[PDB]
Amino acid sequence: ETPVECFEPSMLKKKQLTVLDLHPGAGKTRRVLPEIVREAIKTRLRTVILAPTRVVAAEMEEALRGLPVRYMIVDLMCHATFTSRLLQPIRVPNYNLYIMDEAHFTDPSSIAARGYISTRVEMGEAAAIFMTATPPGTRDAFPDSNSPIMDTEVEVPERAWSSGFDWVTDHSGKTVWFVPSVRNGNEIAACLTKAGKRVIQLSRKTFETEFQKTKHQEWDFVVTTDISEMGANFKADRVIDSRRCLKPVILDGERVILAGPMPVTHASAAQRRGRIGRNPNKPGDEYLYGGGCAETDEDHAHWLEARMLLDNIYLQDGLIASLYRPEADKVAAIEGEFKLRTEQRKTFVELMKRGDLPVWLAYQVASAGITYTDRRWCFDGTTNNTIMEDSVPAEVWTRHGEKRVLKPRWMDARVCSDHAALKSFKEFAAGKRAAA
Numbered sequence: 001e002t003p004v005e006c007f008e009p010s011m012l013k014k015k016q017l018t019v020l021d022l023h024p025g026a027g028k029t030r031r032v033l034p035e036i037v038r039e040a041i042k043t044r045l046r047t048v049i050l051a052p053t054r055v056v057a058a059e060m061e062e063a064l065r066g067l068p069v070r071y072m073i074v075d076l077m078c079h080a081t082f083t084s085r086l087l088q089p090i091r092v093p094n095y096n097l098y099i100m101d102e103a104h105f106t107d108p109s110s111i112a113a114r115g116y117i118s119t120r121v122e123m124g125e126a127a128a129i130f131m132t133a134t135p136p137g138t139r140d141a142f143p144d145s146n147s148p149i150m151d152t153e154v155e156v157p158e159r160a161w162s163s164g165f166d167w168v169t170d171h172s173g174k175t176v177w178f179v180p181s182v183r184n185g186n187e188i189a190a191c192l193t194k195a196g197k198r199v200i201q202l203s204r205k206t207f208e209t210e211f212q213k214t215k216h217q218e219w220d221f222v223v224t225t226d227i228s229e230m231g232a233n234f235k236a237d238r239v240i241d242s243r244r245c246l247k248p249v250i251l252d253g254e255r256v257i258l259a260g261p262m263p264v265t266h267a268s269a270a271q272r273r274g275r276i277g278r279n280p281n282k283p284g285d286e287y288l289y290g291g292g293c294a295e296t297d298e299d300h301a302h303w304l305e306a307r308m309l310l311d312n313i314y315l316q317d318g319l320i321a322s323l324y325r326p327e328a329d330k331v332a333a334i335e336g337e338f339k340l341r342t343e344q345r346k347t348f349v350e351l352m353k354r355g356d357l358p359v360w361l362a363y364q365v366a367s368a369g370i371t372y373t374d375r376r377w378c379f380d381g382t383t384n385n386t387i388m389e390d391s392v393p394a395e396v397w398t399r400h401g402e403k404r405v406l407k408p409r410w411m412d413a414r415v416c417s418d419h420a421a422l423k424s425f426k427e428f429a430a431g432k433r434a435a436a
């Protein structure tokens with residue numbers, strides 16, 4: 001029940017669930033993971049390794065080079081790819097060993113993957129190892145590091161500034177700056193670029209292509225959302241942490257708002273700080289943070305969305321998987337409330353995979369009996385659901401040649417929270433889709 005600090009071969013026998021909680025940068029992904037894979041191959045286990053992002057998967061594929069590891073014999077895939085396969089009639093192999101790296105990731109597909117895995121372990125069908133420096137319930141924002149970190153609470157700019165904050169731009173090294181949202185990041189990055197800094201911006205939808213730029217010498221700032229908490233490695237000297245995040249909230253079961261900016265969890269703060277202090281021979285790394293931490297409330301939509309996913313994943317006859325027990329208190333929905341019949345469930349998965357809609361929104365459309373290609377719901381909502389861009393109602397040319405105001409029947413604030421998200425939703429509402 002208690003987390004461990006070293007891998008032991010008896011962790012690979014069925015019904016064992018082990019949390020490996022070495023401090024950030026202690027060598028979990030880099031040194032303990034290849035040891036586990038060797039022992040699994042030696043014992044003929046059917047194994048899957050789950051990476052948080054394809055960036056990290058590509059990294060592990062090279063560190064595991066020379067072993068029989070199939071990137072999608074040991075299978076390698078991302079959390080989202082794993083949960084995605086569980087949602088198709090492509091009934092997944094019955095692995096008897098699941099290794100989940102960066103097991104703290106709180107996106108809905110990762111929460112659902114932990115629930116499925118822990119249920120298989122409790123069924124006695126598998127063993128599992130969750131690797132993370134910050135397991136659920138963590139209340140330490142300042143864990144150990146390979147080199148000592150200088151922690152300082154300071155006022156962190158939340159918008160562009162025309163004077164002051166000289167300590168930001170006088171720094172000579174490399175800084176990673178965590179922001180609560182893409183739109184806040186755009187404003188900070190433009191202000192740094194105007195000061196002559198070379199800035200890379202990272203978000204969940206640009207991470208793959210833009211993270212590559214960080215592997216070079218010629219940058220001063222990375223401005224990033226919380227996606228960089230999931231095992232992203234930088235060569236940086238300083239982290240600036242707003243200590244804030246946005247929280248998706250389902251108001252009354254009828255809409256999703258983005259609440260905040262509000263304090264991050266202790267686990268998030270520790271992972272942000274854990275981007276630096278990683279070189280044991282390089283003292284002096286600095287963590288500058290702008291406020292306190294707070295634990296997640298009852299109302300974070302990601303855990304409810306995870307139940308929407310798990311209610312639609314096959315397990316064994318009529319069974320439905322539970323959430324991983326330290327996470328199971330966050331949701332009030334009851335097992336099975338979100339189960340869909342076969343055809344609506346196909347629409348549900350299509351809206352998420354092909355439409356890039358948030359889980360909650362894809363469920364509302366699918367359970368309404370709307371088919372994937374029917375976009376009338378994007379335009380027939382109430383007036384309060386009108387989507388604005390630069391303070392004017394957004395309009396779209398539909399597939400049928402009419403210009404309509406964007407006014408979805410169900411409002412999820414995440415489809416219009418930044419320029420790239422709105423562009424994608426406008427294309428979806430028009431019956432179009434940009435080349436993947």
Ligand SMILES: Nc1nc2c(ncn2[C@@H]2O[C@H](COP(=O)(O)OP(=O)(O)OP(O)(O)=S)[C@@H](O)[C@H]2O)c(=O)[nH]1
Nearest residue numbers: 023024025026027028029030031133231233274278
């Ligand atoms: N990318 C990379 N990192 C290296 C290398 N040699 C040493 N390191 C350092 O060793 C650290 C430990 O690697 P890793 O296995 O990621 O620790 P970890 O416990 O997984 O760190 P955590 O953030 O996810 S909680 C790396 O993050 C990096 O700082 C190298 O050749 N490549």
Ligand SMILES: [Cl-]
Nearest residue numbers: 203204225227
């Ligand atoms: Cl993001």
Ligand SMILES: [Mg+2]
Nearest residue numbers: 028029102231
């Ligand atoms: Mg790691």
Ligand SMILES: [Mg+2]
Nearest residue numbers: 026144145146
């Ligand atoms: Mg150590």
